Design a protein around this ligand. Structure first.
Ligand SMILES: [Zn+2]
Lengths: 50, 50, 75, 78
């Protein structure tokens, strides 16, 4: 994506869009919702994430 | 078509375990060659190998 | 409740007890719980054990027998 | 989806009487390359054919039963 400044940041940091990361880290979320069991399966999971 | 460029008799079938005429199916006839069309009962995969 | 309005086959009933239910014009679970125990025991084929395990499964899914309704049936 | 589905199905199959589960497996080609029939269930279990139909029905009661249905319910929207 486009970049801008993080002036407050510390060296180890990157400002990050939510939605971009949401998409990038999907199957982790799914593994963790089958873990917690909020989505018993992945159709439910996908519907929740949607 | 037979003995052409896509000769499924030689290069493999088009689908998972289905002859061209539809005779033999679903791994019942695993290592079977549809004698009508001379087509092996195997994946579409080997269209990339053979 | 959402569980008043179910047919009893969601409980996975048994054939003898099923014949006892259909024999006695008991349609809804709201119609079940309005019926009383002695109104069942006198009936055909409902002696000792039907009452036992139906008491078990209603103890399972959070309801009981002989309760009282009002504004029934909304249909 | 297919994998978690199928494992859940087998975990439902484990809870039944023997003849129930094995019949309902081979009768549908489950777990095999086979495709076995009401008639052939007659041939193997015992020649009784349509009591197997009634047994199928009774198992569908035993298992549909919305205490087990809800692992399957997400697959209703399939
Ligand atoms: Zn063919």
């Amino acid at each position: 994506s486009v970049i801008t400044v993080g002036p407050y940041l510390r060296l180890h940091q990157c400002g990050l869009p939510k939605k971009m990361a949401l998409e990038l880290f999907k199957p982790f979320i799914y593994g963790k919702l089958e873990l917690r069991g909020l989505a018993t399966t992945i159709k439910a999971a996908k519907k929740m994430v949607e | 078509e037979r003995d052409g460029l896509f000769c499924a008799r030689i290069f493999g079938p088009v689908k998972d375990y289905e002859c061209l005429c539809g005779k033999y199916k679903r791994l019942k006839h695993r290592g079977v060659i549809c004698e009508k069309c001379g087509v092996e009962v195997t994946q579409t995969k080997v269209r990339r190998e053979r | 409740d959402p569980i008043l309005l179910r047919p009893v086959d969601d409980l996975e009933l048994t054939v003898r007890s099923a014949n006892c239910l259909k024999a006695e014009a008991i349609h809804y679970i709201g119609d079940l719980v309005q019926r009383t125990e002695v109104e069942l025991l006198k009936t055909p084929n409902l002696g000792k054990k039907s009452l036992t395990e139906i008491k078990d499964v209603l103890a399972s899914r959070g309801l009981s027998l002989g309760m009282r309704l009002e504004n029934w049936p909304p249909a | 989806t297919t994998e978690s589905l199928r494992a859940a199905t087998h975990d439902v199959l484990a809870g039944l009487t023997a003849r129930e589960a094995k019949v309902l497996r081979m009768r549908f080609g489950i777990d095999m390359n086979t495709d076995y029939t009401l008639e052939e269930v007659g041939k193997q279990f015992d020649v009784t054919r349509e009591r197997i139909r009634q047994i199928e029905a009774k198992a569908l009661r035993k298992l549909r039963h919305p205490s087990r249905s809800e692992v399957l319910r997400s697959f209703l929207d399939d």
